Symmetry: C3
Subunit: 282 residues, 3 copies
């Protein structure tokens, strides 16, 4: 199924019938960072498997729902269970849910992920406002836009210079200052490792040389599809380890440690993003 205008329209039609909500904000939350979705008010939960043309996700299993409702007086749509390219999903499968958001009315997309720290200033538990990226899959002919261009959504050759909105970054920092946790908030450049192996010690050393501050396995595909069709983006990484320190000290990286960091910061991240949604410009 191609992520074209006709197919995205059919999915949006189903959703609008079922939900009644016209959202102008979208959210995609990282693993262990989805509590906010359970607090959406007057909400409607739509399993992906029920929506025409949505990608099949049963081989991976686990949760996969679209959730619509209200937060802070604002109308939002959330993806509960994101699609990652290391699972084998195609370019068309990743892109279709974001293009459906566009047809539903989304103008701003907020994204969180868990990532490894490269910059020596980063500790476990810190947050990084993403200000740019290095897309190794894109340089290597696995960009999410490889294929025919869908002209109704955007141009053949997108410019990513303003993919990460500066005013949204400034609003997120302002709110952290108001609640006295700005000492946790950094900015930086995100390297996309296709994955699913964690970056090796020598890959981490290479990324430090190349100007990367953070490394992870998600987010860049969604950012590019959003930028192509004119949706503004704020993306925030939660740092689970510093891979450069771990390489110097021969310390292991593992998913169990990652999820414990997520639990430690989940409630603060939920409160932060609730306020961001409330404060977004009108």
């Amino acid at each position: 199924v191609v992520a074209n205008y006709e197919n995205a329209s059919m999915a949006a039609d189903y959703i609008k019938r079922v939900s009644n909500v016209l959202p102008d904000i979208g959210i995609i939350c990282g693993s262990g960072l989805g509590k906010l979705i359970e607090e959406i008010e007057e909400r409607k939960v739509i399993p992906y498997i029920n929506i025409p043309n949505f990608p099949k996700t049963t081989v991976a299993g686990h949760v996969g729902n679209l959730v619509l409702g209200s937060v802070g007086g604002r109308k939002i749509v959330a993806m509960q269970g994101r699609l990652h390219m290391y699972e084998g999903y195609s370019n068309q499968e990743i892109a279709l849910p974001i293009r459906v958001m566009k047809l539903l009315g989304v103008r701003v997309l907020l994204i969180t992920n868990l990532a490894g720290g490269i910059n020596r200033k980063l500790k476990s538990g810190d947050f990084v406002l993403i200000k740019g990226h290095i897309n190794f899959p894109g340089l290597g002919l696995n960009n999410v836009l490889v294929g025919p261009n869908q002209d109704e959504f955007g141009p053949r050759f997108p410019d990513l210079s303003n993919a990460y909105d500066r005013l949204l970054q400034q609003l997120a920092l302002k709110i952290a200052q108001e609640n006295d946790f700005q000492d946790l908030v950094h900015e930086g450049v995100y390297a996309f490792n296709g994955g699913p192996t964690y970056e090796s010690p020598d890959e981490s050393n290479m990324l430090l040389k190349l100007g990367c501050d953070v490394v992870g396995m998600s987010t860049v595909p969604e950012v590019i599809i959003a930028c192509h069709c004119g949706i503004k983006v704020l993306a925030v990484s939660l740092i689970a380890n510093n891979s450069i320190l771990d390489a110097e000290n021969d310390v292991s990286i593992n998913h169990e440690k990652v999820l414990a960091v997520a639990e430690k910061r989940a409630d603060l991240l939920q409160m932060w993003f609730k306020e961001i949604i409330t404060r977004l410009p009108l």
Copy 2:
């Protein structure tokens, strides 16, 4: 359809029947840089769609013809409408037209493209003679030769050390000196970004660190197929912007600006390449 000896032979048979021309020079021209093809003498235009085993190009649309005839007394074959890998074409689809050129008798291939400047010496409107490359798709298991080797055309493991012929570079510079535009002509290393997003500001900064002078989304696949089967190459980039300056000044990159640069240099590039063809060794 595999780009093998049998399938390329069937395409060449069709062409030879229709055209009568036995070319020993091939040309592939960049977008907005194809005026020379309209001035081929005693010419024959063959739509790709008519040629056995040529790749299907109707999803992308736009022009796609093989043109045979004479320039400056020399017999040439031109591709009018090149195939780019960011459109989703396979390794076999890119390679088959170059291997057909080989069977038709081509010994020299001249290639132009539009590209972004990385080296701080490069301005919009400059030309770069390509002397080497950094192939990010090739390092990342998307090389144009991934697949079974077609032994009749070349070896399993090609050496690219002499892919860009030095004497052809020297002849191109000599002609620029004769016509007093050598101040526009540089040499440099080309980075292949699979695309179709332009290089991000942080990718541009990375390429500067890694010794790249220019970045673009074409040319390297054709160069590798030509080198594999023993065809000499001259490749020239027309610079449309300096991405490092644009990153420092927060200035946007876009296809409209690119095509205006192409129009500004099209007639000079046509005259230059006409003389190169005329002067090629016998």
Copy 3:
């Protein structure tokens, strides 16, 4: 055919019926470096084409056998004819033979390859004990684990920090010292170039900047599958040229020169690995 638990079990069942050997050591030997396999004692040769669910290898041709037997009193299984990803094999085809080794009882995998030297200390004929890697295909969404995770074999997100066992490296060096060829033995970081073109002169210069000591087109996919399912690895490169010197002196790289180096070191490498197998811990 997916490299899952059911399919690997069916292959292992065939093998166990035919061979009687329960191996706890596996070997994968580089091209021209396979003489040891001909000296396996009380051996059984099983063509890949006869084994249920093994990948089809007839397009590439050439030898493809599993060989079981004894070396130095130890029970081993060897792959005679390795699968390389530049031939077009899928992730599932590369992984299935290593997962079969796991089900057969393999706890240690010894691997050799031929490679190019980047570090200026490396000469043709030197050996490099691999201590880490830079996986360009993995960064670029062509990692061998892209796809659904096979949970019975290992975790969704493997850590590669200890992929190259330190004690095995120390044993290999100890044996070289006992036989007075330690002056040939280095350690270093391996860059995986998907291939099949040799690294270009400018790619070689880039790899030097990024901390790579050696570059080649194999080994990293097998190492990752082995690490995922808990098999210890020793990997050794035989250096056929120094690509940085060749770039400075405009000297060519070619498969014929490579195989002559292999012949020069084959008998010493055979003796070295025979002793390593004999000395492996119990």
